[PDB]
Amino acid sequence: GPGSMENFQKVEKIGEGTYGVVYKARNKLTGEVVALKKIRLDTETEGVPSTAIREISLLKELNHPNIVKLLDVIHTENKLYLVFEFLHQDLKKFMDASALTGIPLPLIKSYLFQLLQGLAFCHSHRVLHRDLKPQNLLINTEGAIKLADFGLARAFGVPVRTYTHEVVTLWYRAPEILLGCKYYSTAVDIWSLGCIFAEMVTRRALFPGDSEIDQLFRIFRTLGTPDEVVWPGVTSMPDYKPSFPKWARQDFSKVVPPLDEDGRSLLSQMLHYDPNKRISAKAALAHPFFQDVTKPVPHLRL
C-alpha cells in the first residue's frame, strides 16, 4: 500500500459496475496512467464485498503480461480504491467500432495466443476466471491484450469441489454449467475463449441465447446434440433431459466459414463437449494455428 489519493489526478470516467465507478487517472509524481476502481464500503451493510476480496487477493498473486496488473489498493474512509494498469480499450469496443470490415488474421492469432498465455497462467495458479468475454479483455495501443475483471474469479482446489452454479455470462457459458453439472473446472474458461475466438473472426456472438435452454439448444444446433459416445456422462447430468431434440452435428467448416484448417482444428478442440477432451490453454499454445505469430511478448509491468 505505497499510495494515497493525493497523488492521483482523475482524468475521466471510463466505466461503471456493481460496486462502483472506474476512472482513468494519472499519478502526478511518476506520470503513470492508471485505472482507479472505487469500491464503496460506506453503503455496504455487509462490510467488504466478497467480489472485492477475491478480486484483490487473487490478483495480488497473478503477475503476468496478459493479466491486468493490480498496482495498489488504498483503504481510506468507507472507501476502497483498486489502482490498475490502464488499458485504453476492451475487445468488444474494438470489434464494434474499428473491425467493421474485419479483424486481420495476424491480430486474431496474436490476441488468441496472448489470451491463452494469461489463462494458462491463471489455471497454473489455481484460479478460474469464470467470466471471459470480450468486454473483460483489455487491449493497449502496443498490441497487448489482457484478461481483466476478476470479480467472478475463484481459487480452486484439486480436485475441484462444487462452486457457484450459473457463472459466466450466458453467451460464453459452457454446456456442463448449463446442464447443472456437480463439478466444473478449467475447461469452462476454455469454452469461453473458444466462443471469443469465433467472435473475433465474425464479430458476432457464436451462441447468443436468451435463456439457459435457448443457449443449450443454440449450442446443440451448432455442434449437434451430444450423446454418451461424444460425451460420457452427459445423459446422467442433473439438468439433462431425454426429450432434448437430437440435432445432427453440422460440418465444423460451416460454423465459422472464413476459418482455415488450423483455425477450425483449434476451435473444435476448444468447443469439445466433454470437458475432459476439451483442450487446455497450455496444450493450445503449441497448436499449429499459432506457427506464424511473431508479435513479441508484452513486458511484465511492475
Binding site: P49, S50, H123, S124, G157
Partner: protein
C-alpha cells in the same frame, strides 16, 4: 480427469508449496503474546469448528480462518477479551472467500452471543484485511490432502475422512503444529490415516510428487500420532464430535494404532 486438472496439478502443487512458506505464521508467536495462550487459541479454534458445523461451512473455510488468525496474532498483540472478535472476523473473511453462500455479518454477530457489535466485527474484518494485506488465498492442509488422495489405489473414504480429521485436530494446538507446513501435516495425516485403515504407507508416488519420505515426515508423524492417541482426553472435543457424523464416515470412532512401526 479435468476435475483433477491433469494439465495443471503439478504447477499448482509447486505453487502451493511456495505460498505455504509465504503464508506461514511465526512459530513462536504465543510467547510474545502477553495476555493470550495456546490454550485460549485452542478454545477459539474449537469454537470455530462448531460455528463451522452450526452453519454447514466448508472445512476449507475453517482451515483458511485459522491461517488468518495465526498470521494476525503473529504481528498483532491481542487482549483475551478481543481474541474472539479476531476469530469472528477471520471466519467472516474465510466465508466470503471460500463459501458459495457465506453467512450474513449479523449471523457472525449472533454466534458471539452479542459480546461484540456489527460495527466491531466489520472494523475488525478491515483490520485483518489490512494486517494480511488481502493476502487471503492461503494453502491449507486440505488443499494438499485432496491432491494426496489422488494417489490412493484404490480410493478409500475412511482413509480420506480420517486424514481430514487428523488434519483438523492439528489446528487446535499451536504447540506443536505451528512448526509444520500445511504440506507436511497433510502428509503426516495422510500416512497415518492410510496406515490405520489399510495398514499401508506413504506411497512412492507421493515421494515423487512431494519430495517427502517417512524419514522427513517422522517428527510431525510422531506428534500427530500422540495427538490422535490422546484425542479422547483433550479438553477440546468439537472435532471428535463432528467426525462421529456419517458425513465423515464416523471416523473419530476408529481406533488409533498403538505403534506406527
Amino acid at each position: 480427469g479435468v476435475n483433477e486438472v491433469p494439465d495443471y496439478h503439478e504447477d499448482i502443487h509447486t505453487y502451493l508449496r511456495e505460498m505455504e512458506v509465504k503464508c506461514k505464521p511465526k512459530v513462536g508467536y504465543m510467547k510474545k503474546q502477553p495476555d493470550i495462550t495456546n490454550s485460549m487459541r485452542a478454545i477459539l479454534v474449537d469454537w470455530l469448528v462448531e460455528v463451522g458445523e452450526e452453519y454447514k461451512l466448508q472445512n476449507e473455510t475453517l482451515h483458511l480462518a485459522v491461517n488468518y488468525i495465526d498470521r494476525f496474532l503473529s504481528s498483532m498483540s491481542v487482549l483475551r477479551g478481543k481474541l474472539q472478535l479476531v476469530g469472528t472476523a477471520a471466519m467472516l473473511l474465510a466465508s466470503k472467500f471460500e463459501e458459495i453462500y457465506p453467512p450474513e455479518v449479523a449471523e457472525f454477530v449472533y454466534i458471539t452471543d452479542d459480546t461484540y457489535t456489527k460495527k466491531q466485527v466489520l472494523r475488525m474484518e478491515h483490520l485483518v484485511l489490512k494486517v494480511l494485506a488481502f493476502d487471503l488465498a492461503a494453502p491449507t492442509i486440505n488443499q494438499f490432502l485432496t491432491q494426496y488422495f489422488l494417489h490412493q489405489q484404490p480410493a478409500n473414504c475412511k482413509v480420506e475422512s480420517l486424514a481430514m480429521f487428523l488434519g483438523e485436530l492439528s489446528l487446535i494446538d499451536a504447540d506443536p503444529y505451528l512448526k509444520y507446513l500445511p504440506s507436511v501435516i497433510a502428509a503426516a495425516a495422510f500416512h497415518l490415516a492410510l496406515y490405520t485403515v489399510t495398514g499401508q504407507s506413504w506411497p512412492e508416488s507421493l515421494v515423487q510428487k512431494t519430495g517427502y519420505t517417512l524419514e522427513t515426515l517422522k517428527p510431525c508423524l510422531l506428534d500427530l500420532h500422540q495427538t490422535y492417541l490422546r484425542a479422547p482426553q483433550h479438553a477440546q472435543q468439537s472435532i471428535r464430535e463432528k467426525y462421529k457424523n456419517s458425513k465423515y464416515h464416523g471416523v473419530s470412532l476408529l481406533n488409533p494404532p498403538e505403534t506406527l512401526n
